[PDB]
Amino acid sequence: QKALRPDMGYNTLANFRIEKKIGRGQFSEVYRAACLLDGVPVALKKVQIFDLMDAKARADCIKEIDLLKQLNHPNVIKYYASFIEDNELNIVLELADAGDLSRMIKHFKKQKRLIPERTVWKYFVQLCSALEHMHSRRVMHRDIKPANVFITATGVVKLGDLGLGRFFSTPYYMSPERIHENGYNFKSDIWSLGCLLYEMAALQSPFYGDKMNLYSLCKKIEQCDYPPLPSDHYSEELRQLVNMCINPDPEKRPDVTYVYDVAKRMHACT
Amino acid sequence: KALRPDMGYNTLANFRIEKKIGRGQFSEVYRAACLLDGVPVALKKVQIFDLMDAKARADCIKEIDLLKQLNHPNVIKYYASFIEDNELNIVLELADAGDLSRMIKHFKKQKRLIPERTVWKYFVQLCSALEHMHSRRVMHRDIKPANVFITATGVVKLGDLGLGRFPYYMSPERIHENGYNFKSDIWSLGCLLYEMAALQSPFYGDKMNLYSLCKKIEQCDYPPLPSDHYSEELRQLVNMCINPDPEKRPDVTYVYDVAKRMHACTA
């Protein structure tokens, strides 16, 4: 417990009280913490940019965090600060007052009821506005999945990358370019976005291996072989947007402005 | 000059100035394009070594460093600040799409009032913005219709083109020469809520001079809003913010809570 420095605001560790570890990754630990200047709860991610990364990875991580902290959008989880202290990159992130789309899905399932189409567009047209904004700054999301999508008591969607909310907390959708080449680009995000549009409508991912077999899973991605959504519940517009996003060739996928445009016209159509 | 993509938003080499869009006491403001991503930006150039004493320079650098940490959808984002060419360079979120000043003039010329529902829609966003700024202990210092931007999608952005921080709505604590504090933002906020409903400032007059203005402010003398068009909730919020005594004005948390409840029921 070092002394407060109000003049530093969110840019020093002395102005936070760590509560407990809530996550650990390849290069990082994540903590629940409280800001001591205003009592706001945050996520404090500590990245070992000197000890666990080569020189290129460190310079790329610092550039990427600097961009993420410039995003100002209602549907993106805030990056409030990034600063070097104690030989680590310290990142201060928002924890939203919202549950994951994963929980919303698991709940609608254990109560056997489909998420209605006019709702699916509700959320999806917020997830799209989020991903438009990130792609406009040349920021790739890299892991779009239900657990990273948060949803406010009020129906406000926050896209994040920690899978952490304030009170409630092989990548989830494997693209062809991941499977075949370990490739990830802007169009990889669009594949995942399509898979998530599907999972909201189906209540499960498009792709499962037979008896959970990982080879069977790769064969089903290569054929884009997923059970069709029931058409009496979902328009051609929707099932067609899925089909456009879940295309093995990333060049042939639509860019996030097209998908966001479709998700705006459908959100006003109802 | 030579592009420097390793530097990001932190050198003048990664921007092309397009045109000048503002002039303040200590600063010039440019529309610019980031050459790394084509994102349009505002570029403010602050004369911290020409026009200021050492005290004002150090206050300006401290304040810009705290403004740089604000992050809220209804606040203009400060992307970067750095010293180059012997000036303090600030790269900021560009709105330039529309502002409450233009929206008020449009309704005026069309001889129509802003529905109360529309007032709360824009006002709750401005209250969210200021509640963020106040929670971080940052005062705005120049709240007026021209600093309230509106994006093409109807999103409010509270900015400060000219850096009028560091007036449109005369406050009692400029008449008394007392000092600008967080309650001085609340007076402006109430004057701005009035102006949205009336399409003119509470103390505006056709033939307006310093004497009459002072008298009016001393008496908090402004024309009542039409109760036929604006609710008791709207007219009483304006009345408690437009209070000579800063210590009796509500804090921004109160004003935001009222705006959040008035928006939810009128929509």
Side-chain angles (χ1 to χ4, degrees), chain A residues 2-111 115-117 119-169 171-211 213-270, chain B residues 2-206 208-267:
Chain A
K2 316 136 112 173
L4 272 61
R5 301 205 258 152
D7 59 300
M8 296 286 168
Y10 275 47
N11 282 326
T12 195
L13 290 171
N15 293 339
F16 298 92
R17 179 181 303 127
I18 298 176
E19 295 159 9
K20 66 207 185 186
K21 259 204 247 305
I22 51 182
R24 173 186 271 235
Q26 205 143 69
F27 308 110
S28 57
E29 311 238 63
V30 193
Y31 302 81
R32 197 196 165 89
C35 184
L36 294 172
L37 311 179
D38 48 22
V40 175
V42 299
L44 169 62
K45 172 179 192 189
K46 293 180 183 283
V47 192
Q48 325 262 49
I49 52 165
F50 303 115
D51 311 0
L52 294 183
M53 288 180 174
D54 60 274
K56 199 173 180 295
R58 174 171 49 260
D60 292 356
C61 166
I62 288 166
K63 300 327 158 280
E64 204 76 281
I65 308 305
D66 283 333
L67 290 181
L68 287 168
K69 63 200 274 223
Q70 293 177 16
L71 301 192
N72 195 15
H73 183 101
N75 305 302
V76 182
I77 283 284
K78 295 346 193 85
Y79 281 68
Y80 289 126
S82 61
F83 59 93
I84 292 165
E85 192 175 334
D86 297 341
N87 219 235
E88 277 162 355
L89 182 72
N90 301 282
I91 308 168
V92 182
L93 297 107
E94 174 187 16
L95 286 172
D97 184 13
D100 319 282
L101 173 66
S102 194
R103 298 187 140 76
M104 183 185 269
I105 279 166
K106 184 189 188 71
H107 167 279
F108 261 73
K109 198 171 172 176
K110 201 180 171 191
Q111 286 193 345
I115 297 168
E117 175 168 334
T119 292
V120 173
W121 292 124
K122 219 227 296 188
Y123 300 155
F124 185 76
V125 73
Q126 305 183 254
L127 189 48
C128 287
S129 41
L131 200 57
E132 199 283 332
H133 182 71
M134 296 177 64
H135 284 190
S136 284
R137 304 328 202 226
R138 306 202 134 280
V139 182
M140 279 175 279
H141 183 281
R142 291 193 215 271
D143 197 15
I144 294 170
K145 61 177 184 198
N148 280 335
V149 178
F150 315 97
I151 310 209
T152 295
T154 186
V156 168
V157 172
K158 283 185 195 303
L159 181 58
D161 55 7
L162 303 171
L164 302 171
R166 181 163 319 189
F167 300 112
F168 302 122
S169 310
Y172 189 84
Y173 303 123
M174 200 113 62
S175 57
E177 55 261 36
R178 176 55 162 68
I179 274 162
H180 284 305
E181 299 151 37
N182 302 272
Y184 206 100
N185 63 66
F186 290 94
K187 296 296 192 63
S188 304
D189 285 342
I190 300 296
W191 171 277
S192 291
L193 183 64
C195 290
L196 191 139
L197 178 57
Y198 178 97
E199 190 156 352
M200 291 189 284
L203 271 34
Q204 62 202 54
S205 310
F207 307 106
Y208 291 105
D210 285 351
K211 293 195 286 184
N213 186 304
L214 185 63
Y215 187 29
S216 163
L217 178 62
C218 296
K219 288 187 278 179
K220 289 190 19 157
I221 289 161
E222 167 182 73
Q223 293 190 346
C224 296
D225 175 21
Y226 57 82
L229 294 178
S231 58
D232 59 327
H233 288 77
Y234 304 110
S235 77
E236 177 146 42
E237 295 79 59
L238 187 161
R239 296 184 282 109
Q240 201 34 45
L241 188 61
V242 181
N243 193 66
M244 279 183 277
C245 287
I246 299 173
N247 187 296
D249 187 2
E251 304 279 30
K252 292 281 182 43
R253 299 178 205 139
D255 80 6
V256 67
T257 62
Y258 169 96
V259 169
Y260 188 28
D261 263 294
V262 180
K264 281 186 297 191
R265 296 186 295 100
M266 281 311 115
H267 177 65
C269 200
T270 287
Chain B
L3 211 84
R4 297 296 301 275
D6 50 297
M7 301 281 331
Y9 275 59
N10 282 117
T11 173
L12 290 172
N14 295 343
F15 302 90
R16 182 183 299 119
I17 291 185
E18 277 163 13
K19 54 175 252 198
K20 177 183 295 187
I21 67 174
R23 200 167 108 108
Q25 179 40 33
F26 304 106
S27 65
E28 320 253 26
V29 198
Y30 299 90
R31 177 179 190 169
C34 189
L35 295 176
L36 296 189
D37 53 18
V39 170
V41 305
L43 173 48
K44 275 174 177 88
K45 290 197 171 154
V46 189
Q47 279 114 325
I48 59 155
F49 295 120
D50 287 344
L51 300 183
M52 312 183 158
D53 61 22
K55 172 67 170 167
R57 171 168 56 257
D59 298 348
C60 181
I61 292 172
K62 283 152 210 227
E63 273 188 38
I64 289 297
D65 290 347
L66 291 174
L67 282 168
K68 215 147 63 159
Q69 294 182 21
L70 298 179
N71 198 336
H72 184 287
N74 299 122
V75 182
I76 284 290
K77 189 79 181 78
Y78 279 56
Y79 298 142
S81 77
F82 53 92
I83 291 156
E84 191 181 332
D85 297 353
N86 307 300
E87 295 184 309
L88 181 57
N89 301 283
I90 308 161
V91 181
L92 316 86
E93 178 182 5
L94 182 73
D96 91 342
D99 67 32
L100 184 53
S101 199
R102 299 217 229 132
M103 183 200 283
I104 286 163
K105 274 180 252 114
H106 171 260
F107 274 79
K108 222 178 162 49
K109 284 186 186 174
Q110 307 240 278
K111 308 195 161 178
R112 294 183 293 110
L113 295 184
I114 306 177
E116 155 152 5
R117 171 180 188 131
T118 304
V119 180
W120 290 118
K121 198 212 307 169
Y122 290 119
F123 189 74
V124 70
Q125 294 179 63
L126 169 62
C127 289
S128 200
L130 189 65
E131 197 274 338
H132 180 63
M133 289 185 78
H134 285 199
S135 66
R136 295 303 184 87
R137 307 199 145 287
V138 176
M139 302 176 196
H140 187 279
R141 295 209 216 266
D142 201 17
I143 291 159
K144 59 176 181 201
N147 270 334
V148 179
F149 304 111
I150 310 184
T151 74
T153 51
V155 177
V156 169
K157 295 273 180 187
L158 180 61
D160 182 7
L161 253 46
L163 292 169
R165 64 171 318 99
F166 289 127
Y168 189 86
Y169 292 132
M170 188 73 69
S171 73
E173 56 265 33
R174 293 332 304 147
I175 291 186
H176 297 80
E177 210 187 52
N178 292 348
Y180 200 103
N181 72 17
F182 295 100
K183 293 304 185 60
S184 313
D185 285 338
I186 296 302
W187 164 281
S188 297
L189 191 61
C191 290
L192 187 146
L193 178 59
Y194 183 86
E195 179 147 2
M196 292 181 74
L199 308 178
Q200 58 193 243
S201 321
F203 305 110
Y204 159 97
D206 293 315
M208 189 50 58
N209 47 96
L210 188 51
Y211 192 99
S212 167
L213 177 67
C214 285
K215 182 178 173 102
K216 274 180 150 47
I217 281 162
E218 190 191 61
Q219 308 182 329
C220 284
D221 181 15
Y222 59 80
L225 296 168
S227 46
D228 313 277
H229 299 263
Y230 304 103
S231 75
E232 187 193 338
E233 292 86 343
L234 195 146
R235 296 185 287 99
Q236 183 48 27
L237 186 56
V238 159
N239 185 43
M240 63 181 83
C241 295
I242 299 183
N243 186 301
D245 183 359
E247 270 164 30
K248 294 205 195 84
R249 298 175 200 143
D251 74 11
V252 65
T253 290
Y254 174 86
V255 178
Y256 182 33
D257 281 326
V258 168
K260 282 186 302 198
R261 287 145 185 76
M262 290 308 299
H263 179 51
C265 95
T266 204

